[PDB]
Amino acid sequence: MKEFYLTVEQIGDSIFERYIDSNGRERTREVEYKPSLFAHCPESQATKYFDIYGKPCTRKLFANMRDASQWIKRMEDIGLEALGMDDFKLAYLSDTYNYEIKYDHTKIRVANFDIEVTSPDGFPEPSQAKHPIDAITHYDSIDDRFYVFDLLNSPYGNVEEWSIEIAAKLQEQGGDEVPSEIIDKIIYMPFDNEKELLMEYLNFWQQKTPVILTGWNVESFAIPYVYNRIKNIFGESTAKRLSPHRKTRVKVIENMYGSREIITLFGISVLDYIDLYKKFSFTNQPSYSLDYISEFELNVGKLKYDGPISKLRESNHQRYISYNIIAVYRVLQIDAKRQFINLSLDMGYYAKIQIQSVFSPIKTWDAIIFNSLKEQNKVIPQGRSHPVQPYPGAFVKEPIPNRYKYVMSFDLTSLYPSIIRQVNISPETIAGTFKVAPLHDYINAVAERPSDVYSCSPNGMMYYKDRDGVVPTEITKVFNQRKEHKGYMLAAQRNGEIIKEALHNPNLSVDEPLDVDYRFDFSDEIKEKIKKLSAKSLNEMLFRAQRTEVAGMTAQINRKLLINSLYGALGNVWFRYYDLRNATAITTFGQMALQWIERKVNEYLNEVCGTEGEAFVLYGDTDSIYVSADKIIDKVGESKFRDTNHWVDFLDKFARERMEPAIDRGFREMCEYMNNKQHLMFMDREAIAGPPLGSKGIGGFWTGKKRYALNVWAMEGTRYAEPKLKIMGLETQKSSTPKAVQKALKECIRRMLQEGEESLQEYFKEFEKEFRQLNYISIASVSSANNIAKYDVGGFPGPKCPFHIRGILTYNRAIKGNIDAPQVVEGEKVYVLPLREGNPFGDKCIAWPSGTEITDLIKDDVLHWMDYTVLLEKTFIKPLEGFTSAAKLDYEKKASLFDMFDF
Numbered sequence: 001m002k003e004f005y006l007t008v009e010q011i012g013d014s015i016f017e018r019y020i021d022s023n024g025r026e027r028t029r030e031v032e033y034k035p036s037l038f039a040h041c042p043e044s045q046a047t048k049y050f051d052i053y054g055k056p057c058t059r060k061l062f063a064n065m066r067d068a069s070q071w072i073k074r075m076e077d078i079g080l081e082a083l084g085m086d087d088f089k090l091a092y093l094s095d096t097y098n099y100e101i102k103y104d105h106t107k108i109r110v111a112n113f114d115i116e117v118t119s120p121d122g123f124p125e126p127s128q129a130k131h132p133i134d135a136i137t138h139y140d141s142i143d144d145r146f147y148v149f150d151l152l153n154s155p156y157g158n159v160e161e162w163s164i165e166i167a168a169k170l171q172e173q174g175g176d177e178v179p180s181e182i183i184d185k186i187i188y189m190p191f192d193n194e195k196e197l198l199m200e201y202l203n204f205w206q207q208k209t210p211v212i213l214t215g216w217n218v219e220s221f222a223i224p225y226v227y228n229r230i231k232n233i234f235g236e237s238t239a240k241r242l243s244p245h246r247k248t249r250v251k252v253i254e255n256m257y258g259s260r261e262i263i264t265l266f267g268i269s270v271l272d273y274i275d276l277y278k279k280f281s282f283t284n285q286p287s288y289s290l291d292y293i294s295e296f297e298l299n300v301g302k303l304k305y306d307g308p309i310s311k312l313r314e315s316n317h318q319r320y321i322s323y324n325i326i327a328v329y330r331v332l333q334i335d336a337k338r339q340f341i342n343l344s345l346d347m348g349y350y351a352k353i354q355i356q357s358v359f360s361p362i363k364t365w366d367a368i369i370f371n372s373l374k375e376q377n378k379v380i381p382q383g384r385s386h387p388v389q390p391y392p393g394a395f396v397k398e399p400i401p402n403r404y405k406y407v408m409s410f411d412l413t414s415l416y417p418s419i420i421r422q423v424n425i426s427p428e429t430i431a432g433t434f435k436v437a438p439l440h441d442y443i444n445a446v447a448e449r450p451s452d453v454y455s456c457s458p459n460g461m462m463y464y465k466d467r468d469g470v471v472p473t474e475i476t477k478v479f480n481q482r483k484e485h486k487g488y489m490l491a492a493q494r495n496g497e498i499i500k501e502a503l504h505n506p507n508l509s510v511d512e513p514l515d516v517d518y519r520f521d522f523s524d525e526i527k528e529k530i531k532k533l534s535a536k537s538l539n540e541m542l543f544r545a546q547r548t549e550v551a552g553m554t555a556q557i558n559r560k561l562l563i564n565s566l567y568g569a570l571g572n573v574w575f576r577y578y579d580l581r582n583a584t585a586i587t588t589f590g591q592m593a594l595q596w597i598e599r600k601v602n603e604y605l606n607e608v609c610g611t612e613g614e615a616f617v618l619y620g621d622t623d624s625i626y627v628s629a630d631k632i633i634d635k636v637g638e639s640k641f642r643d644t645n646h647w648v649d650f651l652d653k654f655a656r657e658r659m660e661p662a663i664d665r666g667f668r669e670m671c672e673y674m675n676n677k678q679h680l681m682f683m684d685r686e687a688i689a690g691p692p693l694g695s696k697g698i699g700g701f702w703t704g705k706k707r708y709a710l711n712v713w714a715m716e717g718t719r720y721a722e723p724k725l726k727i728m729g730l731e732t733q734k735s736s737t738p739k740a741v742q743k744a745l746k747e748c749i750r751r752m753l754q755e756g757e758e759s760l761q762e763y764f765k766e767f768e769k770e771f772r773q774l775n776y777i778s779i780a781s782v783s784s785a786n787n788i789a790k791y792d793v794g795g796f797p798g799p800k801c802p803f804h805i806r807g808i809l810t811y812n813r814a815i816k817g818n819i820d821a822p823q824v825v826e827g828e829k830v831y832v833l834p835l836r837e838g839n840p841f842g843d844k845c846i847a848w849p850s851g852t853e854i855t856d857l858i859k860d861d862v863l864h865w866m867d868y869t870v871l872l873e874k875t876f877i878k879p880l881e882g883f884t885s886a887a888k889l890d891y892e893k894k895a896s897l898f899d900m901f902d903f
């Protein structure tokens with residue numbers, strides 16, 4: 001139709017495939033696949049196959065996959081190279097889908113679910129599944145229904161059916177406000193016991209077996225928990241029924257504290273959306289909790305509730321179930337906006353790989369390159385093992401801590417992939433080495449020019465300029481595909497307009513939507529036929545034109561990801577095409593590039609500004625420099641500017657018309673120094689920051705590498721109505737920072753940058769005065785409770801015991817056998833508050849489970865012995881002092897000679 005695959009797996013000598021057929025129905029076949037590998041062969045043996053080094057290869061076709069494996073072992077034991085794709089799944093997909101795959105998302109079943117498990121303490125262990133599962137919400141993309149399984153009787157409390165009528169009402173009516181677009185989509189099912197529930201879920205699972213299985217923390221929590229819960233109740237044979245092929249592998253992960261389990265379900269592609277989100281979204285974040293990211297994207301959040309989640313079922317079972325339903329919806333809502341599932345599908349099919357393999361750049365790119373080469377009848381190298389040898393990364397400049405009033409930043413386009421292309425860095429294009437000087441000698445163009453014949457990197461490598469590098473060529477293919485699918489996206493917008501504009505006064509005539517290609521600008525005979533169309537037709541035609549512009553969108557984003565994920569592969573020892581010298585050629589070219597243009601920008605501005613030896617470039621990171629514009633503004637006289645936009649415009653134009661062209665001369669020269677294959681170092685202006693004109697604000701400041709704040713007015717072409725605060729590494733969003741302090745610090749920073757020292761002082765005085773009337777929870781710090789027992793000594797602090805752990809210990813002694821409520825669980829977060837001397841708790845601090853109130857047993861006592869002074873000093877004043885000191889400011893007004901006079 002054509003066929004495409006859904007999932008593929010290798011079990012024994014058989015490939016197990018789930019796929020949509022010619023008729024568009026989901027099917028499953030088991031194919032005894034017959035793999036071919038390749039071996040080097042003599043000058044004479046002659047054929048169409050050659051390895052990437054141009055050495056002839058003879059093909060070996062095997063009886064089964066097991067023999068092919070034996071063969072590799074054998075080849076490699078002798079010492080012979082064993083070439084070809086040793087992951088037979090990719091070879092299967094490559095042979096079975098030997099054409100560009102087009103897929104129908106709607107035929108692919110995407111399950112999106114969430115579990116709830118009441119436990120006494122709150123945070124149940126998935127590998128143990130000790131506690132009943134008391135709510136499952138499983139959204140199905142095919143049905144577009146939410147399947148809610150609700151346990152009514154449980155040792156932790158017997159409750160009664162959730163109310164879909166209440167769920168719908170507003171807060172005021174004691175409603176949960178489950179959105180209308182959803183309410184009708186909910187298929188509620190309650191159960192008298194857990195065994196009943198699970199069995200029903202398991203069977204529901206066979207009837208609608210997910211292809212892509214997602215949700216939030218589904219890999220680390222939901223999936224193992226459900227798996228182990230069932231393994232524990234019904235035994236393993238039953239638990240394995242969560243795999244279409246009844247095959248399962250339990251992998252363990254290790255870290256500083258515990259060991260996670262991660263269940264591999266053969267026949268299913270798990271795309272945990274938190275990982276998915278982390279890896280596809282181009283913005284780092286302080287939290288990746290569902291609620292935070294939901295707030296960030298949707299502006300709404302997860303359902304609110306009273307008390308701990310560990311008590312929400314007994315206390316408010318209504319809210320509990322509605323909250324579960326919404327948690328799932330939020331993930332859907334985010335995906336409806338961000339579209340990472342489809343992006344995964346698009347990428348998966350493009351590379352011809354298990355969809356989940358979008359999490360593995362080495363795997364993804366290996367497939368892409370393997371396929372590309374296969375069609376040239378080329379043979380891929382055998383993967384060789386290598387030591388994990390660290391190597392230089394990116395240049396980061398040590399900023400001089402200070403205020404920086406006017407600032408402009410420039411960065412480099414797709415730096416690493418650009419360098420790969422410019423230098424022509426591939427395993428087979430390596431042509432030699434040169435004797436190498438220290439890096440700074442190449443930076444300053446003082447070292448002897450490396451080569452007049454080969455393309456060079458400052459790490460002392462040389463590459464051919466004639467040949468066509470496997471790698472560089474392959475990432476160019478992707479730069480082109482991106483340009484191509486933006487074409488489509490635009491022609492599909494200029495076509496949406498042509499459609500929108502005949503919709504004003506169509507004909508009432510009855511006709512059909514035209515059969516045209518929306519990727520290309522409508523011809524003339526279609527320009528007319530479109531007028532004569534009816535509303536109903538034109539309306540379909542637009543839905544189609546828009547759907548196309550969105551396929552253009554997806555495709556071009558997809559390419560950006562591939563492009564950007566390549567270098568990560570190249571520096572990974574497990575990559576087929578890894579080579580340490582190449583990884584080093586790239587990163588140290590980068591360092592040279594940034595510092596060389598750094599010097600170039602400095603020379604230019606000193607010159608152009610009359611000065612000599614001024615340091616214009618104040619900071620730099622990887623592929624972006626930060627230039628101080630103070631002397632450029634003074635050179636013109638600030639007095640000459642009508643308003644903020646006046647000076648912003650001026651710098652925009654100054655960067656565009658003078659700096660950028662100098663910058664480009666600077667890079668063309670570097671290209672020639674290194675005799676590179678082509679110039680691809682393109683640096684353009686990004687941000688324009690500074691105080692509003694005529695105000696007292698400082699514009700911005702740096703406390704050190706990656707720690708700084710700027711008041712930005714322009715980001716490339718786009719300019720902001722109100723300036724944007726660019727804050728980085730100042731911990732004004734870090735989880736530990738008390739919520740009130742987070743808002744207070746951002747405000748301080750804003751005032752410093754936009755209004756001045758006096759405004760800052762006004763606020764500091766303001767917040768200090770207000771501090772002791774705030775809710776204790778908004779001013780408490782947050783920490784993770786790691787190694788609790790390690791520092792537990794008869795209930796008292798051990799040696800080298802962290803401050804927050806001490807708080808937890810103080811807390812445990814105060815709640816020794818009570819409600820019990822609540823309990824501090826290992827690995828989880830806690831609020832932390834200091835205590836004054838001579839408190840009943842017998843220590844200088846106390847910590848309790850975050851997101852909860854302090855049990856009434858001790859709350860008021862705690863609040864009475866809070867050390868506000870220490871709290872304010874450690875959490876607020878300490879950080880603020882760091883800022884002010886760096887920016888050369890006083891947050892408290894200095895004594896004056898006129899202090900005594902009563903003006």
Ligand SMILES: Nc1nc2c(ncn2[C@@H]2O[C@H](CO)[C@@H](O)[C@H]2O)c(=O)[nH]1
Pocket residue numbers: 035036037049083084085091095370373374375377378379380
């Ligand atoms: N040309 C080529 N064929 C390969 C490679 N790896 C596996 N093959 C096999 O070659 C056939 C395609 O020519 C398929 O049956 C693959 O199984 C490779 O790296 N290059």
Ligand SMILES: [Cl-]
Pocket residue numbers: 281282283
């Ligand atoms: Cl983003």
Ligand SMILES: [Cl-]
Pocket residue numbers: none
């Ligand atoms: Cl971009």
Ligand SMILES: [Cl-]
Pocket residue numbers: 719720721722
């Ligand atoms: Cl704006």
